[PDB]
Amino acid sequence: AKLTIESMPLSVAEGKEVLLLVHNLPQHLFGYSWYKGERVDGNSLIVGYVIGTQQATPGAAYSGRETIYTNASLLIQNVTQNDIGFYTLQVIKSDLVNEEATGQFHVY
């Protein structure tokens, strides 16, 4: 089944926090990368996470707000009014047949 992102909650009050849950995560993974926006693009990288070491390394889009968990979920605190709300996960499989999914939340 398709890798999908669920926003918990779907609508988030400005200043509050949103959890991005990941469904249908494939097995035998090497790591995860979360991006701000709709695309895999290193300039929008929030965090790359190596499962084996549990090492999270921030990218240029990391803002202090974002925390990645071992189950691939991304917690975003202190959500801004201007955030269009698109976030993109790339799962990096140990065979490098990698998968992407984009989720969205709606700030009010």
DSSP 75-88: EE-S--TT---EEE
Which string of DSSP letters, residue by residue, matches 7-72?
A: EESSEE-TTS-EEEEEESPPSSEEEEEEEESSS--GGGEEEEEETTTTEEEE-TT--S-EEE-TTS
DSSP letter, residue 94: T
Nearest one of 93, 89, 67, 86 to 3, comparing CA atoms: 89
Task: Name the resolution in angstroms.
Answer: 2.1
Asked if 33 contacts 7 with a C-beta cutoff of 8 angstroms, the reply is no
CATH architecture designation of domain 1-108: Sandwich (2.60)
Q: What residues have CB less than 8 Å from 32, skipping those under 6 apart?
A: 48, 49, 51, 68, 72, 89, 90, 91, 92
Tell me the residue type at 7: S
DSSP letter, residue 4: E
Helix (H, G, I), strand (E, B) or coil at 91: strand
